[PDB]
Amino acid sequence: STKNGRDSNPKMLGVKVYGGQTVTAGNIIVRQRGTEFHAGANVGMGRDHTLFATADGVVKFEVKGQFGRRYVKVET
Amino acid sequence: AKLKTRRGAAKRFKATANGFKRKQAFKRHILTKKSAKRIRQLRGCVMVHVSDVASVRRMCPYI
Amino acid sequence: MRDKIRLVSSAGTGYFYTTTKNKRTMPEKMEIKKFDPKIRQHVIFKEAKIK
RNA sequence: ACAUAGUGUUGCAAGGCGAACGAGGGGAAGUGAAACAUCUCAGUACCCUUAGGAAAAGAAAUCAAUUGAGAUUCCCUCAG
RNA sequence: AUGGGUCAGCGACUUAUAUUCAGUAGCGAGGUUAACCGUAUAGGGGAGCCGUAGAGAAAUCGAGUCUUAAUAGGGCGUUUA
RNA sequence: CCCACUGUCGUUGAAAAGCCAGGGGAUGACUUGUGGAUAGGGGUGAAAGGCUAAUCAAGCCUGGUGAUAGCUGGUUCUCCCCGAAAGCUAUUUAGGUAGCGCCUCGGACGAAUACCAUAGGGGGUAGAGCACUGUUUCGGCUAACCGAUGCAAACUCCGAAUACCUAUGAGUACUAUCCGGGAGACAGACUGCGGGUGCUAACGUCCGUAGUCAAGAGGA
RNA sequence: ACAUAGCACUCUGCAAACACGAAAGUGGACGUAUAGGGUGUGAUGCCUGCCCGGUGCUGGAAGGUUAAUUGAUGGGGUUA
RNA sequence: UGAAGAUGCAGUGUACCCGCGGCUAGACGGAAAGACCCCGUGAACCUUUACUGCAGCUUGACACUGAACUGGUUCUAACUCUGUCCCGUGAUCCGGGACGAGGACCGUGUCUGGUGGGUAGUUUGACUGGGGCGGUCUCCUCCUAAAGAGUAACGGAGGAGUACGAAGGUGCGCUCAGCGUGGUCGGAAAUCACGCGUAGAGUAUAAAGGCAAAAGCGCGCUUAACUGCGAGACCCACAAGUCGAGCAGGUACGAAAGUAGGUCUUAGUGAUCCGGUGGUUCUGUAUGGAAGGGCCAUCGCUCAACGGAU
RNA sequence: GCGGG
RNA sequence: CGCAACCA
Numbered sequence: 013s014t015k016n017g018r019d020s021n022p023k024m025l026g027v028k029v030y031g032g033q034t035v036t037a038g039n040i041i042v043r044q045r046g047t048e049f050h051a052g053a054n055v056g057m058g059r060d061h062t063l064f065a066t067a068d069g070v071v072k073f074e075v076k077g078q079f080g081r082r083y084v085k086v087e088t
Numbered sequence: 089a090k091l092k093t094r095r096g097a098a099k100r101f102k103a104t105a106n107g108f109k110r111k112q113a114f115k116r117h118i119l120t121k122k123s124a125k126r127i128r129q130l131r132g133c134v135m136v137h138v139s140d141v142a143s144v145r146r147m148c149p150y151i
Numbered sequence: 152m153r154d155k156i157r158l159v160s161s162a163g164t165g166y167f168y169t170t171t172k173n174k175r176t177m178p179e180k181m182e183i184k185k186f187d188p189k190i191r192q193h194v195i196f197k198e199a200k201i202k
Numbered sequence: 203a204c205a206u207a208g209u210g211u212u213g214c215a216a217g218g219c220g221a222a223c224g225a226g227g228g229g230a231a232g233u234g235a236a237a238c239a240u241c242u243c244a245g246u247a248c249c250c251u252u253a254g255g256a257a258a259a260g261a262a263a264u265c266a267a268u269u270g271a272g273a274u275u276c277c278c279u280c281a282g
Numbered sequence: 283a284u285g286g287g288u289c290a291g292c293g294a295c296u297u298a299u300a301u302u303c304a305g306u307a308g309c310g311a312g313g314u315u316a317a318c319c320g321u322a323u324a325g326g327g328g329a330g331c332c333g334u335a336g337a338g339a340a341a342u343c344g345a346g347u348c349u350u351a352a353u354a355g356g357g358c359g360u361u362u363a
Numbered sequence: 364c365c366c367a368c369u370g371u372c373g374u375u376g377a378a379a380a381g382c383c384a385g386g387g388g389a390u391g392a393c394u395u396g397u398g399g400a401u402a403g404g405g406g407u408g409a410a411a412g413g414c415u416a417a418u419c420a421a422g423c424c425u426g427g428u429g430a431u432a433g434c435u436g437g438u439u440c441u442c443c444c445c446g447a448a449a450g451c452u453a454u455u456u457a458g459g460u461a462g463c464g465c466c467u468c469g470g471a472c473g474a475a476u477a478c479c480a481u482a483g484g485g486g487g488u489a490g491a492g493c494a495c496u497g498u499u500u501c502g503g504c505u506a507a508c509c510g511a512u513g514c515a516a517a518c519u520c521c522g523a524a525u526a527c528c529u530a531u532g533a534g535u536a537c538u539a540u541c542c543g544g545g546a547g548a549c550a551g552a553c554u555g556c557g558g559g560u561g562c563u564a565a566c567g568u569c570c571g572u573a574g575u576c577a578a579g580a581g582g583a
Numbered sequence: 584a585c586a587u588a589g590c591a592c593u594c595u596g597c598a599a600a601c602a603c604g605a606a607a608g609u610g611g612a613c614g615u616a617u618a619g620g621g622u623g624u625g626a627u628g629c630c631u632g633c634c635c636g637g638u639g640c641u642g643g644a645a646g647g648u649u650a651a652u653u654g655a656u657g658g659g660g661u662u663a
Numbered sequence: 664u665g666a667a668g669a670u671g672c673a674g675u676g677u678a679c680c681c682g683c684g685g686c687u688a689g690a691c692g693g694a695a696a697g698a699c700c701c702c703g704u705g706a707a708c709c710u711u712u713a714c715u716g717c718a719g720c721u722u723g724a725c726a727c728u729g730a731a732c733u734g735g736u737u738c739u740a741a742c743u744c745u746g747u748c749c750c751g752u753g754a755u756c757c758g759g760g761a762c763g764a765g766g767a768c769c770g771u772g773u774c775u776g777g778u779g780g781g782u783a784g785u786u787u788g789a790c791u792g793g794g795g796c797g798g799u800c801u802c803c804u805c806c807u808a809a810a811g812a813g814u815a816a817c818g819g820a821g822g823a824g825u826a827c828g829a830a831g832g833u834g835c836g837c838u839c840a841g842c843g844u845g846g847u848c849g850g851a852a853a854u855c856a857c858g859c860g861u862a863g864a865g866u867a868u869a870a871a872g873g874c875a876a877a878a879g880c881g882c883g884c885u886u887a888a889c890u891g892c893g894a895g896a897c898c899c900a901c902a903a904g905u906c907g908a909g910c911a912g913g914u915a916c917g918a919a920a921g922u923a924g925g926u927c928u929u930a931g932u933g934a935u936c937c938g939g940u941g942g943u944u945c946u947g948u949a950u951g952g953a954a955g956g957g958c959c960a961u962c963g964c965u966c967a968a969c970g971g972a973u
Numbered sequence: 974g975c976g977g978g
Numbered sequence: 979c980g981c982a983a984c985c986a
């Protein structure tokens with residue numbers, strides 16, 4: 013008998029809406045543990061770092077700033 | 089002879105115009121640890137899922 | 152462990168909240184201002200034993 | 203002691219059998235519950251006593267509900 | 283791996299009652315009687331049942347109703363044979 | 364006479380327990396006749412769970428009774444159309460079952476669908492690398508650092524092909540959805556490719572992915 | 584293996600213990616502690632050590648705990 | 664070769680047709696739906712300090728059941744005698760009568776505590792490279808996992824079953840860890856000063872992913888760890904779970920734009936049934952009340968075999 | 974829920 | 979420390 017048999021249930025994280033797709037307000041874009049993506053314009057962040065669309069438009073990923081951050085934003 | 093109702097299920101389901109309604113679980117006795125969102129969103133009635141409607145129709149053939 | 156306690160409204164209404172408390176690091180009865188929705192107003196809720 | 207108990211004679215009656223159905227006295231378990239003990243099976247099988255052409259029940263110390271019905275029994279509903 | 287020595291005959295999805303769906307027939311915002319009576323498959327019997335409205339735990343209201351301080355939002359409903 | 368220790372034979376026997384040769388007891392806690400008593404969770408037992416009518420860890424008969432059996436077996440004429448699965452989740456569940464996945468029929472609605480092109484996306488794998496975490500060889504320096512030099516599922520300064528998501532478009536396909544009726548199935552196998560395990564064993568085992576078999580004959 | 588004579592422990596005062604039986608009753612026994620029941624050991628010879636913590640059993644009864652019963656108190660409901 | 668040990672398949676060798684006496688190497692020969700092994704939410708018996716009943720034994724209360732003198736002592740008239748005598752009677756049963764001995768005991772009924780394998784009905788998990796033994800069973804993190812998601816093994820590693828009224832909110836402020844150089848003990852490593860400083864510190868807690876508008880560290884004031892909700896999504900067999908802008912009310916902080924529906928996030932959990940507590944012009948079996956129920960809030964499960972069979 | 978320490 | 983009460 014060994015001491016390794018455990019694991020947790022899957023969490024289904026990841027990008028839910030890719031670049032160029034249309035969203036409505038409230039649509040979830042990214043499920044992430046930390047902020048590997050940061051909220052740009054028309055994108056909000058939930059308590060578990062979920063990125064969601066706060067407006068209609070199309071999704072657009074970028075690399076911005078001097079920290080080279082990945083940003084999600086919604087174009088209206 | 090006459091089909092008999094499963095009386096325990098007749099206390100859990102009520103017929104709506106196009107389906108059945110039911111109360112939600114997890115709202116009986118362990119309530120301090122639950123957030124106010126879960127307290128207030130588990131409160132009212134909901135509709136019986138369409139995958140349970142067949143067994144509910146076989147259990148309550150008169151509602 | 153932390154014991155369950157009621158915070159009862161001092162407004163006459165039967166409204167209360169429930170929370171936990173560490174009985175050793177907080178022996179005094181908790182008093183905190185909270186919203187009573189029966190009078191729609193912030194009042195003081197005092198600690199009481201869970202029922 | 204009186205008497206009673208007991209004993210005998212005469213008179214009348216009963217006893218036993220037989221289909222189901224009735225009334226009453228007792229009364230399971232297999233089974234189901236996907237296990238099982240409450241519960242179910244079921245007051246069923248079976249045992250016992252005893253009728254009649256039927257039996258039982260029956261003439262409100264009953265129901266109803268804004269003041270109604272009018273003994274009992276059985277059938278359809280009410281209603282799974 | 284199993285079952286059959288062979289022939290002939292017999293041998294296994296039924297019946298009742300409810301209920302749901304489909305077809306078909308009648309009638310149709312209506313449909314239909316049950317026990318029962320009945321020289322009796324007729325005729326009578328409308329008690330009942332289903333449909334025609336929903337919301338709400340319920341009182342209650344009703345094309346709305348529930349929740350709510352809210353006439354806001356939301357749920358379930360609203361032409362529907 | 365009662366018994367039954369040994370051996371052969373017999374074992375569809377002469378016999379559902381014997382014969383034959385030997386063996387034990389043979390005035391006793393003996394053997395035996397006739398009649399009687401004890402009846403089934405009971406009897407009786409110098410006790411072997413023995414015996415109780417060739418039946419005994421609870422007799423036989425009848426009834427309950429057509430007990431129940433998620434288990435075996437079996438399931439009877441013809442043609443035409445379509446056609447699975449051996450998965451997931453849960454289960455005193457694992458050879459059962461239920462919801463979903465997969466089949467079929469009816470209805471509704473008809474390109475919403477798919478294939479390919481183009482466009483737009485996010486990856487952290489293969490490979491690579493040593494910038495971090497580890498590990499590693501040599502040399503210099505007074506252990507840290509420096510130069511050179513390797514390695515990594517749980518290392519990453521990097522980083523494909525594919526796959527996946529969305530939009531637009533040509534052509535070719537009764538496609539895709541939705542509402543109902545009926546299911547079966549939830550033991551899978553092998554081959555290749557990517558892996559865990561094993562001995563970089565197994566017609567081994569457990570996953571992912573494609574094909575075949577399952578349910579598919581023909582040719583090699 | 585069982586039994587066995589012998590041994591020991593223990594129960595039993597007689598309407599005995601104990602057994603059977605629903606009870607009546609019957610066995611024990613028309614016996615009476617030198618008897619009867621249960622338990623173990625097993626002729627005989629020599630013998631049979633230590634442990635009373637556990638579980639039994641026997642004796643004790645100071646205290647705690649504790650049933651039915653009883654029903655003081657207190658609280659509520661009704662309304663003159 | 665092949666469902667893996669062939670009379671029947673492939674290739675090949677041999678062999679005229681058919682008996683009788685022998686023989687037992689094969690026909691996985693015949694016989695008996697394997698007894699061993701495992702499985703079934705079979706069964707039967709047996710055991711016990713498994714569970715739950717009951718018989719029996721026992722305790723007390725009330726009844727049969729009374730009277731005196733003081734918990735007793737005495738009495739007799741209920742009751743008892745498997746004591747003697749008489750009668751029925753020709754009778755070791757039984758009944759009645761007389762006596763004797765007991766005696767309000769004993770015994771029996773109803774209620775009640777204890778005891779109770781004597782008897783009864785039952786239960787006694789699954790996974791598993793057979794089963795047992797061991798281990799495990801729910802949740803979180805990483806790898807396996809093949810660059811979307813998902814993905815198994817008794818594969819490789821670790822954590823959880825909490826904490827906190829501030830460690831929550833807000834406004835304002837701050838920036839580490841390590842090196843060098845100096846300086847009272849004091850020292851490699853405490854505190855002070857000065858220079859660098861590559862993110863290597865920290866984060867209530869495991870790991871991963873994050874963290875400068877710091878999400879890390881302080882100070883002031885505070886209760887948004889609010890109530891009613893909620894477009895729209897993610898994830899999903901269901902039951903559940905997750906995120907959520909915005910709207911109304913009432914707030915806190917801020918000059919203000921604003922920010923707050925707990926905590927950097929992902930573990931810290933348990934359905935239903937039964938019941939408890941608070942509130943409630945919902946109900947209230949003729950009526951008015953009430954009891955009881957409903958509704959809203961909340962409490963009681965190592966139901967840990969963690970979809971929980973009693 | 975009743976006593977003891 | 980013991981005796982007694984245990985039917986989400």
Ligand SMILES: C[NH+](C)c1cc(NC(=O)CNC(C)(C)C)c(O)c2c1C[C@H]1C[C@H]3[C@H]([NH+](C)C)C(O)=C(C(N)=O)C(=O)[C@@]3(O)C(O)=C1C2=O
Binds near residue numbers: 078079080861
């Ligand atoms: C474009 N780069 C060259 C840049 C420019 C400026 N200057 C400005 O924008 C303002 N002053 C200018 C315009 C030059 C006159 C910059 O100010 C900066 C930087 C670079 C960043 C890099 C940062 C980086 N991380 C935090 C994303 C980092 O890891 C380091 C580092 N040394 O490791 C940095 O130094 C960094 O934090 C940093 O400081 C940067 C700049 O400040």
Ligand SMILES: C[NH+](C)c1cc(NC(=O)CNC(C)(C)C)c(O)c2c1C[C@H]1C[C@H]3[C@H]([NH+](C)C)C(O)=C(C(N)=O)C(=O)[C@@]3(O)C(O)=C1C2=O
Binds near residue numbers: 080862
């Ligand atoms: C804390 N911030 C203000 C900061 C400051 C400096 N530089 C200084 O402090 C300057 N030093 C002085 C005092 C001027 C001499 C910094 O140099 C840095 C950083 C930030 C870190 C951030 C790192 C980060 N991860 C690894 C925690 C990260 O993922 C990135 C990134 N771009 O994705 C980084 O850049 C980061 O690795 C990094 O390099 C930082 C700095 O270098």
Ligand SMILES: C[NH+](C)c1cc(NC(=O)CNC(C)(C)C)c(O)c2c1C[C@H]1C[C@H]3[C@H]([NH+](C)C)C(O)=C(C(N)=O)C(=O)[C@@]3(O)C(O)=C1C2=O
Binds near residue numbers: 861
């Ligand atoms: C270009 N970036 C990526 C960069 C790289 C390095 N290099 C390293 O740290 C290398 N270290 C290794 C060996 C790779 C670990 C760098 O060392 C730096 C920087 C950023 C500069 C920026 C400087 C800047 N100028 C305008 C003076 C500046 O104003 C700031 C600022 N306002 O914050 C800086 O931070 C800056 O002075 C600075 O410190 C930089 C670096 O040191």
Ligand SMILES: [Mg+2]
């Ligand atoms: Mg980064």
Ligand SMILES: [Mg+2]
Binds near residue numbers: 116
């Ligand atoms: Mg509640």
Ligand SMILES: [Mg+2]
């Ligand atoms: Mg039963």
Ligand SMILES: [Mg+2]
Binds near residue numbers: 235
């Ligand atoms: Mg059963």
Ligand SMILES: [Mg+2]
Binds near residue numbers: 236
């Ligand atoms: Mg069953």
Ligand SMILES: [Mg+2]
């Ligand atoms: Mg065989």
Ligand SMILES: [Mg+2]
């Ligand atoms: Mg055969």
Ligand SMILES: [Mg+2]
């Ligand atoms: Mg035939």
Ligand SMILES: [Mg+2]
């Ligand atoms: Mg002889």
Ligand SMILES: [Mg+2]
Binds near residue numbers: 389
């Ligand atoms: Mg002799």
Ligand SMILES: [Mg+2]
Binds near residue numbers: 403421
């Ligand atoms: Mg028997």
Ligand SMILES: [Mg+2]
């Ligand atoms: Mg007997």
Ligand SMILES: [Mg+2]
């Ligand atoms: Mg034996």
